[PDB]
PDB file of all heavy atoms in Angstrom:
ATOM      1  N   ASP A  80      13.314  -0.885  -2.051  1.00 57.76           N
ATOM      2  CA  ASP A  80      12.739   0.072  -2.967  1.00 57.76           C
ATOM      3  C   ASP A  80      11.326  -0.321  -3.353  1.00 57.76           C
ATOM      4  O   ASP A  80      10.470   0.572  -3.465  1.00 57.76           O
ATOM      5  CB  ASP A  80      13.633   0.194  -4.216  1.00 57.76           C
ATOM      6  CG  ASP A  80      14.188  -1.113  -4.677  1.00 57.76           C
ATOM      7  OD1 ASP A  80      13.612  -2.206  -4.338  1.00 57.76           O
ATOM      8  OD2 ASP A  80      15.177  -1.130  -5.402  1.00 57.76           O
ATOM      9  N   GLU A  81      11.059  -1.583  -3.589  1.00 56.30           N
ATOM     10  CA  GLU A  81       9.745  -2.040  -3.973  1.00 56.30           C
ATOM     11  C   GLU A  81       8.688  -1.782  -2.908  1.00 56.30           C
ATOM     12  O   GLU A  81       7.604  -1.230  -3.173  1.00 56.30           O
ATOM     13  CB  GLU A  81       9.761  -3.500  -4.353  1.00 56.30           C
ATOM     14  CG  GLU A  81      10.770  -3.857  -5.425  1.00 56.30           C
ATOM     15  CD  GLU A  81      11.638  -5.043  -5.069  1.00 56.30           C
ATOM     16  OE1 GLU A  81      11.279  -5.810  -4.162  1.00 56.30           O
ATOM     17  OE2 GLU A  81      12.681  -5.215  -5.716  1.00 56.30           O
ATOM     18  N   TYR A  82       9.041  -2.070  -1.653  1.00 55.20           N
ATOM     19  CA  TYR A  82       8.069  -1.898  -0.568  1.00 55.20           C
ATOM     20  C   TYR A  82       7.778  -0.427  -0.330  1.00 55.20           C
ATOM     21  O   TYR A  82       6.607   0.001  -0.147  1.00 55.20           O
ATOM     22  CB  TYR A  82       8.530  -2.538   0.696  1.00 55.20           C
ATOM     23  CG  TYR A  82       7.813  -2.048   1.939  1.00 55.20           C
ATOM     24  CD1 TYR A  82       6.452  -2.246   2.091  1.00 55.20           C
ATOM     25  CD2 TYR A  82       8.468  -1.336   2.952  1.00 55.20           C
ATOM     26  CE1 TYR A  82       5.759  -1.828   3.214  1.00 55.20           C
ATOM     27  CE2 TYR A  82       7.799  -0.904   4.083  1.00 55.20           C
ATOM     28  CZ  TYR A  82       6.473  -1.130   4.204  1.00 55.20           C
ATOM     29  OH  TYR A  82       5.788  -0.684   5.306  1.00 55.20           O
ATOM     30  N   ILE A  83       8.817   0.424  -0.295  1.00 56.07           N
ATOM     31  CA  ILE A  83       8.561   1.876  -0.104  1.00 56.07           C
ATOM     32  C   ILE A  83       7.862   2.458  -1.318  1.00 56.07           C
ATOM     33  O   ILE A  83       7.034   3.366  -1.123  1.00 56.07           O
ATOM     34  CB  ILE A  83       9.913   2.578   0.221  1.00 56.07           C
ATOM     35  CG1 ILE A  83       9.625   3.969   0.785  1.00 56.07           C
ATOM     36  CG2 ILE A  83      10.805   2.622  -1.039  1.00 56.07           C
ATOM     37  CD1 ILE A  83       8.650   3.983   1.923  1.00 56.07           C
ATOM     38  N   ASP A  84       8.120   1.946  -2.515  1.00 53.04           N
ATOM     39  CA  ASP A  84       7.372   2.419  -3.647  1.00 53.04           C
ATOM     40  C   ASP A  84       5.895   2.084  -3.532  1.00 53.04           C
ATOM     41  O   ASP A  84       5.036   2.930  -3.806  1.00 53.04           O
ATOM     42  CB  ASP A  84       7.940   1.779  -4.945  1.00 53.04           C
ATOM     43  CG  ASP A  84       9.134   2.546  -5.466  1.00 53.04           C
ATOM     44  OD1 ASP A  84       9.801   3.283  -4.659  1.00 53.04           O
ATOM     45  OD2 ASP A  84       9.436   2.413  -6.681  1.00 53.04           O
ATOM     46  N   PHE A  85       5.553   0.857  -3.105  1.00 53.12           N
ATOM     47  CA  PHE A  85       4.167   0.505  -2.913  1.00 53.12           C
ATOM     48  C   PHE A  85       3.528   1.361  -1.840  1.00 53.12           C
ATOM     49  O   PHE A  85       2.387   1.807  -1.944  1.00 53.12           O
ATOM     50  CB  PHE A  85       4.070  -0.968  -2.548  1.00 53.12           C
ATOM     51  CG  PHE A  85       2.934  -1.306  -1.649  1.00 53.12           C
ATOM     52  CD1 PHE A  85       1.607  -1.268  -2.063  1.00 53.12           C
ATOM     53  CD2 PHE A  85       3.159  -1.588  -0.303  1.00 53.12           C
ATOM     54  CE1 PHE A  85       0.568  -1.540  -1.200  1.00 53.12           C
ATOM     55  CE2 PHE A  85       2.156  -1.890   0.563  1.00 53.12           C
ATOM     56  CZ  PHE A  85       0.849  -1.828   0.112  1.00 53.12           C
ATOM     57  N   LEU A  86       4.284   1.573  -0.728  1.00 53.28           N
ATOM     58  CA  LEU A  86       3.753   2.396   0.355  1.00 53.28           C
ATOM     59  C   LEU A  86       3.426   3.817  -0.119  1.00 53.28           C
ATOM     60  O   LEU A  86       2.397   4.376   0.259  1.00 53.28           O
ATOM     61  CB  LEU A  86       4.722   2.418   1.514  1.00 53.28           C
ATOM     62  CG  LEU A  86       4.222   2.994   2.831  1.00 53.28           C
ATOM     63  CD1 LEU A  86       2.818   2.495   3.126  1.00 53.28           C
ATOM     64  CD2 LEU A  86       5.177   2.660   3.956  1.00 53.28           C
ATOM     65  N   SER A  87       4.325   4.418  -0.893  1.00 54.54           N
ATOM     66  CA  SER A  87       4.086   5.757  -1.411  1.00 54.54           C
ATOM     67  C   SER A  87       2.919   5.762  -2.384  1.00 54.54           C
ATOM     68  O   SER A  87       2.094   6.671  -2.387  1.00 54.54           O
ATOM     69  CB  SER A  87       5.339   6.317  -2.055  1.00 54.54           C
ATOM     70  OG  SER A  87       5.605   5.672  -3.291  1.00 54.54           O
ATOM     71  N   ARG A  88       2.845   4.756  -3.243  1.00 56.05           N
ATOM     72  CA  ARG A  88       1.828   4.766  -4.301  1.00 56.05           C
ATOM     73  C   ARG A  88       0.457   4.361  -3.757  1.00 56.05           C
ATOM     74  O   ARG A  88      -0.565   4.874  -4.289  1.00 56.05           O
ATOM     75  CB  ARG A  88       2.212   3.781  -5.400  1.00 56.05           C
ATOM     76  CG  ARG A  88       3.349   4.269  -6.297  1.00 56.05           C
ATOM     77  CD  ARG A  88       3.432   3.512  -7.582  1.00 56.05           C
ATOM     78  NE  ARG A  88       3.234   2.065  -7.390  1.00 56.05           N
ATOM     79  CZ  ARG A  88       4.084   1.144  -7.695  1.00 56.05           C
ATOM     80  NH1 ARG A  88       5.243   1.429  -8.266  1.00 56.05           N
ATOM     81  NH2 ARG A  88       3.796  -0.115  -7.453  1.00 56.05           N
ATOM     82  N   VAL A  89       0.369   3.497  -2.753  1.00 55.32           N
ATOM     83  CA  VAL A  89      -0.953   3.023  -2.270  1.00 55.32           C
ATOM     84  C   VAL A  89      -1.695   4.181  -1.635  1.00 55.32           C
ATOM     85  O   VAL A  89      -1.171   5.019  -0.913  1.00 55.32           O
ATOM     86  CB  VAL A  89      -0.750   1.873  -1.280  1.00 55.32           C
ATOM     87  CG1 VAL A  89      -0.067   2.300  -0.016  1.00 55.32           C
ATOM     88  CG2 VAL A  89      -2.116   1.205  -0.998  1.00 55.32           C
ATOM     89  N   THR A  90      -3.001   4.253  -1.963  1.00 53.37           N
ATOM     90  CA  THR A  90      -3.948   5.231  -1.455  1.00 53.37           C
ATOM     91  C   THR A  90      -5.194   4.503  -0.990  1.00 53.37           C
ATOM     92  O   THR A  90      -5.435   3.387  -1.393  1.00 53.37           O
ATOM     93  CB  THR A  90      -4.281   6.268  -2.510  1.00 53.37           C
ATOM     94  OG1 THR A  90      -5.211   5.741  -3.459  1.00 53.37           O
ATOM     95  CG2 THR A  90      -3.056   6.773  -3.272  1.00 53.37           C
ATOM     96  N   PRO A  91      -6.026   5.118  -0.137  1.00 57.61           N
ATOM     97  CA  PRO A  91      -7.246   4.459   0.342  1.00 57.61           C
ATOM     98  C   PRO A  91      -8.261   4.211  -0.807  1.00 57.61           C
ATOM     99  O   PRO A  91      -9.327   3.651  -0.538  1.00 57.61           O
ATOM    100  CB  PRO A  91      -7.807   5.424   1.369  1.00 57.61           C
ATOM    101  CG  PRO A  91      -6.647   6.260   1.755  1.00 57.61           C
ATOM    102  CD  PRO A  91      -5.785   6.403   0.570  1.00 57.61           C
ATOM    103  N   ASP A  92      -7.955   4.666  -2.002  1.00 59.13           N
ATOM    104  CA  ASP A  92      -8.844   4.531  -3.139  1.00 59.13           C
ATOM    105  C   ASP A  92      -8.414   3.506  -4.181  1.00 59.13           C
ATOM    106  O   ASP A  92      -9.220   2.754  -4.677  1.00 59.13           O
ATOM    107  CB  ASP A  92      -9.041   5.876  -3.851  1.00 59.13           C
ATOM    108  CG  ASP A  92     -10.216   6.704  -3.244  1.00 59.13           C
ATOM    109  OD1 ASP A  92     -11.247   6.093  -2.974  1.00 59.13           O
ATOM    110  OD2 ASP A  92     -10.032   7.923  -3.047  1.00 59.13           O
ATOM    111  N   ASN A  93      -7.093   3.464  -4.482  1.00 62.38           N
ATOM    112  CA  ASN A  93      -6.584   2.568  -5.505  1.00 62.38           C
ATOM    113  C   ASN A  93      -6.032   1.271  -4.923  1.00 62.38           C
ATOM    114  O   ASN A  93      -5.071   0.702  -5.469  1.00 62.38           O
ATOM    115  CB  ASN A  93      -5.537   3.286  -6.380  1.00 62.38           C
ATOM    116  CG  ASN A  93      -4.368   3.726  -5.550  1.00 62.38           C
ATOM    117  OD1 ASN A  93      -4.314   3.598  -4.315  1.00 62.38           O
ATOM    118  ND2 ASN A  93      -3.358   4.260  -6.236  1.00 62.38           N
ATOM    119  N   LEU A  94      -6.590   0.790  -3.799  1.00 62.32           N
ATOM    120  CA  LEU A  94      -6.074  -0.453  -3.228  1.00 62.32           C
ATOM    121  C   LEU A  94      -6.482  -1.662  -4.080  1.00 62.32           C
ATOM    122  O   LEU A  94      -5.802  -2.714  -4.012  1.00 62.32           O
ATOM    123  CB  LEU A  94      -6.624  -0.603  -1.771  1.00 62.32           C
ATOM    124  CG  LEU A  94      -8.125  -0.678  -1.467  1.00 62.32           C
ATOM    125  CD1 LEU A  94      -8.305  -0.993   0.011  1.00 62.32           C
ATOM    126  CD2 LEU A  94      -8.893   0.574  -1.804  1.00 62.32           C
ATOM    127  N   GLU A  95      -7.549  -1.577  -4.834  1.00 61.68           N
ATOM    128  CA  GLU A  95      -7.966  -2.661  -5.694  1.00 61.68           C
ATOM    129  C   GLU A  95      -6.910  -3.013  -6.748  1.00 61.68           C
ATOM    130  O   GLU A  95      -6.648  -4.194  -6.978  1.00 61.68           O
ATOM    131  CB  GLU A  95      -9.282  -2.366  -6.347  1.00 61.68           C
ATOM    132  CG  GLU A  95      -9.353  -1.043  -7.130  1.00 61.68           C
ATOM    133  CD  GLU A  95      -9.841   0.105  -6.284  1.00 61.68           C
ATOM    134  OE1 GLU A  95      -9.914  -0.056  -5.027  1.00 61.68           O
ATOM    135  OE2 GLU A  95     -10.195   1.165  -6.832  1.00 61.68           O
ATOM    136  N   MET A  96      -6.290  -2.009  -7.330  1.00 63.26           N
ATOM    137  CA  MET A  96      -5.224  -2.202  -8.278  1.00 63.26           C
ATOM    138  C   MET A  96      -3.938  -2.647  -7.594  1.00 63.26           C
ATOM    139  O   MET A  96      -3.051  -3.205  -8.266  1.00 63.26           O
ATOM    140  CB  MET A  96      -4.962  -0.946  -9.116  1.00 63.26           C
ATOM    141  CG  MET A  96      -5.812  -0.842 -10.360  1.00 63.26           C
ATOM    142  SD  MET A  96      -5.404   0.571 -11.397  1.00 63.26           S
ATOM    143  CE  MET A  96      -5.209   1.846 -10.094  1.00 63.26           C
ATOM    144  N   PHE A  97      -3.808  -2.383  -6.306  1.00 66.24           N
ATOM    145  CA  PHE A  97      -2.613  -2.729  -5.519  1.00 66.24           C
ATOM    146  C   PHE A  97      -2.803  -3.945  -4.641  1.00 66.24           C
ATOM    147  O   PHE A  97      -2.036  -4.167  -3.711  1.00 66.24           O
ATOM    148  CB  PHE A  97      -2.159  -1.523  -4.708  1.00 66.24           C
ATOM    149  CG  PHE A  97      -1.414  -0.494  -5.516  1.00 66.24           C
ATOM    150  CD1 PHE A  97      -1.889   0.817  -5.555  1.00 66.24           C
ATOM    151  CD2 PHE A  97      -0.264  -0.836  -6.172  1.00 66.24           C
ATOM    152  CE1 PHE A  97      -1.204   1.779  -6.264  1.00 66.24           C
ATOM    153  CE2 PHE A  97       0.422   0.146  -6.911  1.00 66.24           C
ATOM    154  CZ  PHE A  97      -0.047   1.446  -6.966  1.00 66.24           C
ATOM    155  N   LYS A  98      -3.885  -4.710  -4.874  1.00 64.89           N
ATOM    156  CA  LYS A  98      -4.181  -5.873  -4.016  1.00 64.89           C
ATOM    157  C   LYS A  98      -3.059  -6.894  -4.006  1.00 64.89           C
ATOM    158  O   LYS A  98      -2.848  -7.581  -3.042  1.00 64.89           O
ATOM    159  CB  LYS A  98      -5.508  -6.512  -4.445  1.00 64.89           C
ATOM    160  CG  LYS A  98      -6.723  -5.834  -3.866  1.00 64.89           C
ATOM    161  CD  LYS A  98      -7.980  -6.325  -4.547  1.00 64.89           C
ATOM    162  CE  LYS A  98      -9.251  -5.816  -3.843  1.00 64.89           C
ATOM    163  NZ  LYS A  98     -10.469  -6.011  -4.671  1.00 64.89           N
ATOM    164  N   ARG A  99      -2.357  -7.051  -5.144  1.00 64.03           N
ATOM    165  CA  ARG A  99      -1.232  -7.986  -5.217  1.00 64.03           C
ATOM    166  C   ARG A  99      -0.166  -7.630  -4.184  1.00 64.03           C
ATOM    167  O   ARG A  99       0.307  -8.457  -3.407  1.00 64.03           O
ATOM    168  CB  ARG A  99      -0.624  -8.037  -6.633  1.00 64.03           C
ATOM    169  CG  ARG A  99       0.263  -9.219  -6.884  1.00 64.03           C
ATOM    170  CD  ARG A  99       1.730  -8.847  -6.845  1.00 64.03           C
ATOM    171  NE  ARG A  99       1.945  -7.597  -7.647  1.00 64.03           N
ATOM    172  CZ  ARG A  99       2.581  -7.557  -8.817  1.00 64.03           C
ATOM    173  NH1 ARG A  99       3.039  -8.653  -9.415  1.00 64.03           N
ATOM    174  NH2 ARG A  99       2.719  -6.395  -9.443  1.00 64.03           N
ATOM    175  N   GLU A 100       0.254  -6.348  -4.169  1.00 62.06           N
ATOM    176  CA  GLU A 100       1.230  -5.898  -3.183  1.00 62.06           C
ATOM    177  C   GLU A 100       0.639  -5.957  -1.785  1.00 62.06           C
ATOM    178  O   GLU A 100       1.340  -6.256  -0.812  1.00 62.06           O
ATOM    179  CB  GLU A 100       1.705  -4.513  -3.505  1.00 62.06           C
ATOM    180  CG  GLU A 100       2.342  -4.368  -4.892  1.00 62.06           C
ATOM    181  CD  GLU A 100       1.332  -3.963  -5.944  1.00 62.06           C
ATOM    182  OE1 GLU A 100       0.156  -4.377  -5.869  1.00 62.06           O
ATOM    183  OE2 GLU A 100       1.702  -3.153  -6.821  1.00 62.06           O
ATOM    184  N   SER A 101      -0.687  -5.644  -1.636  1.00 59.13           N
ATOM    185  CA  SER A 101      -1.319  -5.651  -0.329  1.00 59.13           C
ATOM    186  C   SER A 101      -1.247  -7.022   0.299  1.00 59.13           C
ATOM    187  O   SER A 101      -0.909  -7.152   1.521  1.00 59.13           O
ATOM    188  CB  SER A 101      -2.738  -5.170  -0.449  1.00 59.13           C
ATOM    189  OG  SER A 101      -2.788  -3.759  -0.566  1.00 59.13           O
ATOM    190  N   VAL A 102      -1.555  -8.087  -0.435  1.00 59.53           N
ATOM    191  CA  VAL A 102      -1.409  -9.418   0.087  1.00 59.53           C
ATOM    192  C   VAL A 102       0.040  -9.818   0.237  1.00 59.53           C
ATOM    193  O   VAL A 102       0.427 -10.547   1.142  1.00 59.53           O
ATOM    194  CB  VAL A 102      -2.197 -10.439  -0.779  1.00 59.53           C
ATOM    195  CG1 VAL A 102      -1.609 -10.569  -2.165  1.00 59.53           C
ATOM    196  CG2 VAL A 102      -2.228 -11.790  -0.093  1.00 59.53           C
ATOM    197  N   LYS A 103       0.921  -9.308  -0.686  1.00 62.41           N
ATOM    198  CA  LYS A 103       2.327  -9.649  -0.609  1.00 62.41           C
ATOM    199  C   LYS A 103       3.035  -8.918   0.546  1.00 62.41           C
ATOM    200  O   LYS A 103       3.844  -9.510   1.257  1.00 62.41           O
ATOM    201  CB  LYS A 103       3.047  -9.318  -1.897  1.00 62.41           C
ATOM    202  CG  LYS A 103       4.377 -10.016  -2.078  1.00 62.41           C
ATOM    203  CD  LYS A 103       5.331  -9.178  -2.893  1.00 62.41           C
ATOM    204  CE  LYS A 103       6.787  -9.583  -2.605  1.00 62.41           C
ATOM    205  NZ  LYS A 103       7.727  -8.532  -3.025  1.00 62.41           N
ATOM    206  N   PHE A 104       2.685  -7.649   0.755  1.00 60.29           N
ATOM    207  CA  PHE A 104       3.368  -6.809   1.752  1.00 60.29           C
ATOM    208  C   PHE A 104       2.596  -6.759   3.064  1.00 60.29           C
ATOM    209  O   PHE A 104       3.005  -6.023   3.977  1.00 60.29           O
ATOM    210  CB  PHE A 104       3.583  -5.407   1.205  1.00 60.29           C
ATOM    211  CG  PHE A 104       4.721  -5.281   0.221  1.00 60.29           C
ATOM    212  CD1 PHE A 104       4.545  -4.619  -0.964  1.00 60.29           C
ATOM    213  CD2 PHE A 104       5.927  -5.921   0.453  1.00 60.29           C
ATOM    214  CE1 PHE A 104       5.578  -4.533  -1.916  1.00 60.29           C
ATOM    215  CE2 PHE A 104       6.963  -5.851  -0.476  1.00 60.29           C
ATOM    216  CZ  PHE A 104       6.768  -5.152  -1.667  1.00 60.29           C
ATOM    217  N   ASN A 105       1.494  -7.515   3.187  1.00 58.93           N
ATOM    218  CA  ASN A 105       0.711  -7.616   4.419  1.00 58.93           C
ATOM    219  C   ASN A 105       0.230  -6.249   4.897  1.00 58.93           C
ATOM    220  O   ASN A 105       0.560  -5.805   6.010  1.00 58.93           O
ATOM    221  CB  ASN A 105       1.569  -8.345   5.487  1.00 58.93           C
ATOM    222  CG  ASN A 105       0.738  -8.678   6.720  1.00 58.93           C
ATOM    223  OD1 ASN A 105      -0.483  -8.553   6.749  1.00 58.93           O
ATOM    224  ND2 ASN A 105       1.418  -9.072   7.792  1.00 58.93           N
ATOM    225  N   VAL A 106      -0.549  -5.621   4.051  1.00 60.14           N
ATOM    226  CA  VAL A 106      -1.136  -4.294   4.353  1.00 60.14           C
ATOM    227  C   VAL A 106      -2.615  -4.394   4.170  1.00 60.14           C
ATOM    228  O   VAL A 106      -3.102  -4.808   3.102  1.00 60.14           O
ATOM    229  CB  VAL A 106      -0.531  -3.206   3.450  1.00 60.14           C
ATOM    230  CG1 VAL A 106      -1.312  -1.917   3.663  1.00 60.14           C
ATOM    231  CG2 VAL A 106       0.923  -2.990   3.758  1.00 60.14           C
ATOM    232  N   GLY A 107      -3.388  -4.058   5.196  1.00 57.29           N
ATOM    233  CA  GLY A 107      -4.812  -4.046   5.091  1.00 57.29           C
ATOM    234  C   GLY A 107      -5.522  -4.667   6.314  1.00 57.29           C
ATOM    235  O   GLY A 107      -6.619  -4.230   6.665  1.00 57.29           O
ATOM    236  N   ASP A 108      -4.936  -5.653   6.935  1.00 54.18           N
ATOM    237  CA  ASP A 108      -5.557  -6.353   8.064  1.00 54.18           C
ATOM    238  C   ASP A 108      -5.266  -5.626   9.351  1.00 54.18           C
ATOM    239  O   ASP A 108      -6.206  -5.177  10.069  1.00 54.18           O
ATOM    240  CB  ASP A 108      -5.054  -7.776   8.130  1.00 54.18           C
ATOM    241  CG  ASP A 108      -5.312  -8.579   6.838  1.00 54.18           C
ATOM    242  OD1 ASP A 108      -6.138  -8.126   6.061  1.00 54.18           O
ATOM    243  OD2 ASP A 108      -4.623  -9.598   6.619  1.00 54.18           O
ATOM    244  N   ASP A 109      -4.003  -5.462   9.721  1.00 60.66           N
ATOM    245  CA  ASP A 109      -3.557  -4.665  10.862  1.00 60.66           C
ATOM    246  C   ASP A 109      -2.845  -3.388  10.497  1.00 60.66           C
ATOM    247  O   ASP A 109      -2.397  -2.674  11.351  1.00 60.66           O
ATOM    248  CB  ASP A 109      -2.699  -5.517  11.799  1.00 60.66           C
ATOM    249  CG  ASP A 109      -3.486  -6.006  13.037  1.00 60.66           C
ATOM    250  OD1 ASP A 109      -4.719  -5.843  13.062  1.00 60.66           O
ATOM    251  OD2 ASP A 109      -2.836  -6.561  13.919  1.00 60.66           O
ATOM    252  N   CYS A 110      -2.688  -3.146   9.187  1.00 61.06           N
ATOM    253  CA  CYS A 110      -2.004  -1.936   8.699  1.00 61.06           C
ATOM    254  C   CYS A 110      -2.920  -1.271   7.688  1.00 61.06           C
ATOM    255  O   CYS A 110      -2.681  -1.266   6.498  1.00 61.06           O
ATOM    256  CB  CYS A 110      -0.671  -2.334   8.082  1.00 61.06           C
ATOM    257  SG  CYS A 110       0.670  -2.560   9.224  1.00 61.06           S
ATOM    258  N   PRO A 111      -4.040  -0.669   8.157  1.00 60.59           N
ATOM    259  CA  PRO A 111      -5.025  -0.075   7.252  1.00 60.59           C
ATOM    260  C   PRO A 111      -4.440   1.059   6.480  1.00 60.59           C
ATOM    261  O   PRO A 111      -3.618   1.834   7.006  1.00 60.59           O
ATOM    262  CB  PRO A 111      -6.131   0.336   8.173  1.00 60.59           C
ATOM    263  CG  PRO A 111      -5.505   0.572   9.485  1.00 60.59           C
ATOM    264  CD  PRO A 111      -4.365  -0.384   9.591  1.00 60.59           C
ATOM    265  N   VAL A 112      -4.890   1.232   5.248  1.00 61.95           N
ATOM    266  CA  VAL A 112      -4.493   2.363   4.407  1.00 61.95           C
ATOM    267  C   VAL A 112      -5.417   3.514   4.679  1.00 61.95           C
ATOM    268  O   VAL A 112      -6.655   3.396   4.576  1.00 61.95           O
ATOM    269  CB  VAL A 112      -4.502   1.959   2.922  1.00 61.95           C
ATOM    270  CG1 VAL A 112      -3.248   1.077   2.625  1.00 61.95           C
ATOM    271  CG2 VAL A 112      -5.761   1.181   2.586  1.00 61.95           C
ATOM    272  N   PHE A 113      -4.847   4.633   5.029  1.00 58.96           N
ATOM    273  CA  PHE A 113      -5.634   5.838   5.393  1.00 58.96           C
ATOM    274  C   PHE A 113      -5.005   7.051   4.725  1.00 58.96           C
ATOM    275  O   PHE A 113      -3.945   6.922   4.034  1.00 58.96           O
ATOM    276  CB  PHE A 113      -5.689   5.994   6.918  1.00 58.96           C
ATOM    277  CG  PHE A 113      -4.332   6.129   7.581  1.00 58.96           C
ATOM    278  CD1 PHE A 113      -3.850   7.381   7.995  1.00 58.96           C
ATOM    279  CD2 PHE A 113      -3.551   5.034   7.777  1.00 58.96           C
ATOM    280  CE1 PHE A 113      -2.587   7.495   8.551  1.00 58.96           C
ATOM    281  CE2 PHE A 113      -2.314   5.128   8.399  1.00 58.96           C
ATOM    282  CZ  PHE A 113      -1.840   6.366   8.778  1.00 58.96           C
ATOM    283  N   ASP A 114      -5.613   8.199   4.877  1.00 59.74           N
ATOM    284  CA  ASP A 114      -5.135   9.444   4.279  1.00 59.74           C
ATOM    285  C   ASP A 114      -3.810   9.811   4.810  1.00 59.74           C
ATOM    286  O   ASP A 114      -3.530   9.788   6.017  1.00 59.74           O
ATOM    287  CB  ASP A 114      -6.142  10.541   4.487  1.00 59.74           C
ATOM    288  CG  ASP A 114      -6.357  10.834   5.952  1.00 59.74           C
ATOM    289  OD1 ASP A 114      -6.325   9.898   6.778  1.00 59.74           O
ATOM    290  OD2 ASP A 114      -6.575  12.017   6.299  1.00 59.74           O
ATOM    291  N   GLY A 115      -2.907  10.206   3.891  1.00 59.51           N
ATOM    292  CA  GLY A 115      -1.541  10.652   4.312  1.00 59.51           C
ATOM    293  C   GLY A 115      -0.722   9.597   5.011  1.00 59.51           C
ATOM    294  O   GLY A 115       0.094   9.929   5.868  1.00 59.51           O
ATOM    295  N   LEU A 116      -0.932   8.319   4.683  1.00 57.28           N
ATOM    296  CA  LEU A 116      -0.192   7.246   5.371  1.00 57.28           C
ATOM    297  C   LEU A 116       1.309   7.365   5.064  1.00 57.28           C
ATOM    298  O   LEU A 116       2.137   7.271   5.972  1.00 57.28           O
ATOM    299  CB  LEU A 116      -0.714   5.903   4.910  1.00 57.28           C
ATOM    300  CG  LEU A 116       0.190   4.694   4.954  1.00 57.28           C
ATOM    301  CD1 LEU A 116       0.476   4.296   6.417  1.00 57.28           C
ATOM    302  CD2 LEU A 116      -0.432   3.531   4.218  1.00 57.28           C
ATOM    303  N   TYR A 117       1.642   7.610   3.791  1.00 57.91           N
ATOM    304  CA  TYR A 117       3.066   7.823   3.467  1.00 57.91           C
ATOM    305  C   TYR A 117       3.575   9.061   4.130  1.00 57.91           C
ATOM    306  O   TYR A 117       4.748   9.105   4.540  1.00 57.91           O
ATOM    307  CB  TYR A 117       3.232   7.931   1.976  1.00 57.91           C
ATOM    308  CG  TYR A 117       4.690   8.215   1.551  1.00 57.91           C
ATOM    309  CD1 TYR A 117       5.640   7.207   1.583  1.00 57.91           C
ATOM    310  CD2 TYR A 117       5.098   9.482   1.179  1.00 57.91           C
ATOM    311  CE1 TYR A 117       6.956   7.421   1.250  1.00 57.91           C
ATOM    312  CE2 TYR A 117       6.394   9.725   0.812  1.00 57.91           C
ATOM    313  CZ  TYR A 117       7.296   8.682   0.858  1.00 57.91           C
ATOM    314  OH  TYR A 117       8.614   8.941   0.508  1.00 57.91           O
ATOM    315  N   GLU A 118       2.760  10.107   4.317  1.00 58.69           N
ATOM    316  CA  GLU A 118       3.197  11.282   5.056  1.00 58.69           C
ATOM    317  C   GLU A 118       3.431  10.970   6.521  1.00 58.69           C
ATOM    318  O   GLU A 118       4.411  11.463   7.109  1.00 58.69           O
ATOM    319  CB  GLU A 118       2.167  12.411   4.875  1.00 58.69           C
ATOM    320  CG  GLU A 118       1.678  12.666   3.463  1.00 58.69           C
ATOM    321  CD  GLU A 118       2.818  13.097   2.462  1.00 58.69           C
ATOM    322  OE1 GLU A 118       3.991  13.064   2.819  1.00 58.69           O
ATOM    323  OE2 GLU A 118       2.424  13.457   1.341  1.00 58.69           O
TER     324      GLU A 118
END
């Protein structure tokens, strides 16, 4: 639930507030956040 919640909530704009999950869930290096990623 936590990972899918972060995936739904994360946007290409509010990644600074989600940096803790980004480093924890390994998103940003090879899994870039883009428009409609959850979609």
Side-chain angles (χ1 to χ4, degrees):
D80 39 22
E81 302 131 19
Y82 163 63
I83 195 50
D84 276 23
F85 147 74
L86 191 43
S87 72
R88 286 197 320 238
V89 67
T90 77
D92 271 317
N93 61 355
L94 60 174
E95 53 267 14
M96 271 185 318
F97 282 121
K98 277 168 171 166
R99 194 257 314 253
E100 303 93 322
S101 283
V102 66
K103 197 214 159 198
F104 286 132
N105 189 10
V106 172
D108 305 340
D109 259 7
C110 280
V112 284
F113 58 102
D114 59 326
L116 155 70
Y117 178 76
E118 311 301 6

